[PDB]
């Protein structure tokens, strides 16, 4: 029984890392879009 | 040059990767909820 | 001892998946005020 | 149209819930170091 | 073999829990950061 | 106003920290793994 118990925590901590390396992932593009946003916001400022 | 369509589709699979990542964790708890 | 660690260890993991989700569902909506903020600055652009 | 007032009021909650997942993570550290 | 295998299972959850602190604080920077870029905008726009 | 230096710094450096979250990760599915 304990050992079944052991399996299913592995089982589930190999989902809730699956969910953090997503969110990681997700969260580097939108830091790397709000660098991109910025740098576009610099550019487009110059004339106006 | 920030390309506009790309930017939303971007951010919007962004948003879709997080939906992904909830679904693992409702799967985790549902294995938890079982023990 | 062993049944006691193990529940432990589910107890921690599920506090674990609280903060992974609390943390999704932030990055959820930061990535929508940022879509918000674009659509603000393309269509607040026009004039100037 | 962009309401400032509540940009600011949603980017500061999600700062809040930050805080929140901070919090539950202490929570489980704990439980792992009594075992 | 159990004890080692339940050793290991907490060993692996600090490490997650490590990532989701890292991550955690990483999305609380970026979300100052958007609320600064925000700012910046609003406190540019005046002239133009 | 918003130093641009520091903002492009501050943002590289978030960055940097999610590298280290993932190694964090493959630290933790690499024990798992072992099991």
């Given at each position: 029984?304990?050992?079944?118990?052991?399996?299913?925590?592995?089982?589930?901590?190999?989902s809730?890392?699956?969910?953090?390396?997503?969110?990681?992932?997700?969260?580097?593009?939108?830091?790397?879009?709000?660098?991109?946003?910025?740098?576009?916001?610099?550019?487009?400022?110059?004339?106006? | 040059?920030?390309?506009?369509?790309?930017?939303?589709?971007?951010?919007?699979?962004?948003?879709?990767?997080?939906?992904?990542?909830?679904?693992?964790?409702?799967?985790?708890?549902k294995?938890?909820?079982?023990?």
């Amino acid at each position: 029984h304990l050992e079944g118990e052991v399996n299913k925590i592995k089982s589930a901590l190999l989902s809730t890392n699956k969910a953090v390396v997503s969110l990681s992932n997700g969260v580097s593009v939108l830091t790397s879009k709000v660098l991109d946003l910025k740098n576009y916001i610099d550019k487009q400022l110059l004339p106006i | 040059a920030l390309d506009p369509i790309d930017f939303s589709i971007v951010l919007n699979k962004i948003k879709s990767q997080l939906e992904e990542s909830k679904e693992w964790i409702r799967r985790s708890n549902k294995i938890l909820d079982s023990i």
